[PDB]
């Protein structure tokens, strides 16, 4: 029940607004629009050493939100920062998910439990345990196309054939692993094969890019003359 | 739980023998497993389920109702949108 | 004699002229005008350079009754021969509005003068349709599969227009219009595309109701008309073939250069965005110094 203005604000105000929106959306299971909001918030915020409190809080959230999607933010990210001290927990949280070992993830979230609770990503860390598993079976399907559930149990220490069957079955509804199970032959056969320059797929993709380019077109046109018209009106030599 | 499992297994495979259905979808009688399937719109013919039936029928229904031409977007429609953005 | 009237290129001068003659004899109320056409022949393109009026009085009781002066035609031809000597009888114009079968008898009379086969150029004076106001025909002799002997009948000729270098630039001087059938800018071609499509729609609808009129209202059956429609169906395009899959692929490539070019203009326009904002910063400095100078300017006006 909107009334937020984009009329006359500071870029301070857009940074606060976009932070609160991303965060709120995260726990209610929408991660996609939250991505837009938090990526947006950092850039709008003034980049300075007295603003380091607000900026530091945004960086922590953003990576955590990337892990929630099942995408992985850069190891490059945690390393070249001068944020390293505070970005000490997140690096391990990303690494645990990336390598898809569940045992590492359990030790991490225990060990940093105090640090995370402050920044209140702790409730989100519990949800990331789903995302662990997702990364760990993603690797297996990509590396071996056709692999028996038996071998997946060996590799990632699943309990049984059944336990992994259910994981995949749930996962491919959401299109994460992108495979199909062969029940009778006892394996998982991966369905990714690319080459969609035969498909009609490029047209939709391209149109979304042309809509971003059209947004940039509208956005320049209105704003350019506007300082000029005021500045011409005011007296000069 | 049963309905959640039931949805996920359509994607996985087209067919599971009657016995493999009972274990997955959690029943205690083989006659309940078969009855549930009939009501849910899978025919058991030759002790093989056909998960594909319901999926085709749901899909047929979406094509039956019409909102439909714009949401997918025609070729003609994309190209008409470019020219008019420019020309304002 | 021959058929060599495959293309008829018609000067714009002639059309203009035909309307001018028609009004200055004041033939109205279903009265007609005939004049000679002068021009080139023994060329596949028949060139209509020029026309001149013949006095012709056409009756209202019948269409089979007419007066035409044979003595007149030669005098007209020899004077025009003096001007340019590449002009010979190549037919006669009818003022339309439409074809007649009493024109067949007139055709045969012009066949004496000619050394080509007479062009009957129905120049419409009614300007009907958005396309050409000329249909062209030549009287040709045929037998036919029906059991029809020695028929004289008029076969349609496609009409085109060409004009000379001097003649064309005459048009351009006279007019200055941008036209509704032009294929110019983005907007104009958008209009042509809708117009072209609706063009086809109109012709096809006629064909459908013409078919009905053979088979219940006893219009004649003709192998030329049926034969043409068969060809349409045989060379009809098909989709879902590997031709179509390729057309989509070609289609992505054209979408692709439109996308790249859209991004390119964004960079030039955002350059302009910044630069307006740099000029404002400089004009600010200038405006502040200006105010001290305006104080003295306000003051002088009060003092005197």
Curated annotation (Swiss-Prot), chain A:
It comes from the Eukaryota. Disulfide bonds: none annotated. Residues 225-237 have a biased composition (Basic and acidic residues). The modification Phosphoserine is found at residue 199. Residues 15-195 form the PCI domain. N-acetylated by NAT1. Acts as a regulatory subunit of the 26S proteasome which is involved in the ATP-dependent degradation of ubiquitinated proteins. The 26S proteasome is composed of a core protease, known as the 20S proteasome, capped at one or both ends by the 19S regulatory complex (RC). The RC is composed of at least 18 different subunits in two subcomplexes, the base and the lid, which form the portions proximal and distal to the 20S proteolytic core, respectively. Present with 16700 molecules/cell in log phase SD medium. Belongs to the proteasome subunit S3 family. This is 26S proteasome regulatory subunit RPN3. It comes from Saccharomyces cerevisiae (strain ATCC 204508 / S288c).
Curated annotation (Swiss-Prot), chain B:
One of its GO terms (biological process) is proteasome-mediated ubiquitin-dependent protein catabolic process. It comes from the Eukaryota. Keywords: Proteasome. GO terms for cellular component: nucleus; proteasome complex; proteasome regulatory particle, lid subcomplex; proteasome storage granule. Present with 9890 molecules/cell in log phase SD medium. Belongs to the proteasome subunit S14 family. Acts as a regulatory subunit of the 26S proteasome which is involved in the ATP-dependent degradation of ubiquitinated proteins. Necessary for activation of the CDC28 kinase. This is 26S proteasome regulatory subunit RPN12. The gene is RPN12. The chain holds residues 185 to 272 of 274 of the full protein.
UniProtKB/Swiss-Prot annotation, chain C:
It comes from the Eukaryota. It holds the Pfam family MitMem_reg. GO terms for cellular component: proteasome complex; proteasome regulatory particle, lid subcomplex; proteasome storage granule. GO terms for biological process: proteasome-mediated ubiquitin-dependent protein catabolic process; ubiquitin-dependent protein catabolic process. CDD domains: MPN_RPN7_8 (cd08062). The modification N-acetylserine is found at residue 2. Residues 8-143 form the MPN domain. The keyword Acetylation applies. N-acetylated by NAT1. Keywords: Acetylation, Phosphoprotein, Proteasome. GO terms for molecular function: metallopeptidase activity. Acts as a regulatory subunit of the 26S proteasome which is involved in the ATP-dependent degradation of ubiquitinated proteins. Present with 19800 molecules/cell in log phase SD medium. Belongs to the peptidase M67A family. This is 26S proteasome regulatory subunit RPN8.
């Amino acid at each position: 029940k909107l009334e937020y203005p984009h009329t006359d604000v500071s870029s301070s105000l857009e940074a606060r607004y976009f932070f609160y929106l991303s965060k709120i959306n995260a726990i209610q299971l929408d991660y996609s629009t939250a991505n837009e909001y938090i990526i947006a918030a950092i850039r709008k915020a003034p980049h300075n050493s007295k603003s380091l409190g607000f900026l530091q809080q945004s960086n922590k959230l953003h990576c955590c939100i990337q892990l929630l999607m099942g995408d992985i933010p850069e190891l490059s990210f945690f390393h070249q920062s001068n944020m390293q001290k505070s970005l000490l927990p997140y690096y391990h949280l990303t690494k645990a998910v990336k390598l898809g070992d569940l045992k590492k993830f359990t030790s991490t979230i225990t060990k940093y439990k105090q640090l995370l609770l402050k920044d209140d990503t702790y409730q989100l860390c519990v949800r990331l345990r789903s995302n662990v598993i997702k990364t760990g079976i993603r690797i297996i399907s990509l590396t071996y196309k056709k692999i028996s559930l038996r071998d997946i149990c060996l590799k990632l220490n699943l309990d049984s054939e059944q336990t992994v069957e259910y994981m995949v079955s749930r996962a491919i509804r959401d299109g994460v692993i992108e495979a199909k199970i062969n029940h009778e032959d006892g394996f998982i056969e991966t369905t990714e094969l690319l080459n969609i320059y035969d498909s009609e797929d490029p047209q939709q993709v391209f149109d979304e890019r042309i809509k971003f380019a059209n947004q940039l077109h509208d956005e320049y046109l209105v704003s350019m003359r506007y300082p000029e018209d005021k500045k011409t009106q005011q007296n000069e030599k | 739980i049963r309905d959640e499992i039931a949805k996920n297994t359509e994607l996985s495979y087209d067919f599971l023998p009657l016995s493999n259905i009972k274990a997955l979808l959690f029943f205690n009688n083989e006659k309940e497993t078969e009855k549930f399937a009939l009501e849910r719109n899978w025919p058991i013919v030759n002790s093989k389920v056909y998960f594909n039936n319901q999926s085709k029928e749901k899909a047929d229904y979406e094509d039956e109702m019409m909102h439909e031409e714009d949401q997918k977007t025609n070729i003609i429609e994309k190209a008409m949108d470019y020219a008019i953005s420019i020309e304002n | 004699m021959s058929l060599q009237h495959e293309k008829v290129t018609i000067a714009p001068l002639v059309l203009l002229s035909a309307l001018d003659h028609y009004e200055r004899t004041q033939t109205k109320e279903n009265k007609r005008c005939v004049g000679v056409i002068l021009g080139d022949a023994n060329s596949s393109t028949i060139r209509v350079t020029n026309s001149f009026a013949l006095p012709f009085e056409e009756d209202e009781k019948n269409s089979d009754v007419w007066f035409l002066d044979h003595n007149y035609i030669e005098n007209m031809n020899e004077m025009c021969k003096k001007i340019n000597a590449k002009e010979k009888l190549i037919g006669w114009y009818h003022s339309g509005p439409k074809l007649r079968a009493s024109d067949l008898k007139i055709n045969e009379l012009f066949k004496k003068y000619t050394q080509n086969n007479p062009l009957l150029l129905i120049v419409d004076v009614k300007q009907q349709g958005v396309g050409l106001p000329t249909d062209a025909y030549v009287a040709i002799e045929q037998v036919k599969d029906d059991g029809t002997s020695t028929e004289k009948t008029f076969l349609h000729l496609p009409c085109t227009i060409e004009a000379e270098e001097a003649e064309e630039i005459g048009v351009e001087h006279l007019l200055r219009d941008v036209r509704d059938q032009a294929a110019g800018g983005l907007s104009i071609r958008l209009t042509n595309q809708l117009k072209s499509l609706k063009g086809l729609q109109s012709k096809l609808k006629d064909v459908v109701e013409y078919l009905d009129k053979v088979i219940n209202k006893e219009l004649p059956i003709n192998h030329t008309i049926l034969g043409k429609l068969q060809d349409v169906f045989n060379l009809l395009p098909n989709l879902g073939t590997p031709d179509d899959d390729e057309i989509d692929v070609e289609n992505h490539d054209r979408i692709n250069i439109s996308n790249n070019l859209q991004k390119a203009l964004t960079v030039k326009t955002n350059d302009e965005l910044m630069v307006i904002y740099i000029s404002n910063l400089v004009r600010s400095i200038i405006a502040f110094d200006d105010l001290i100078e305006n104080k003295i300017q306000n003051k002088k006006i009060q003092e005197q």
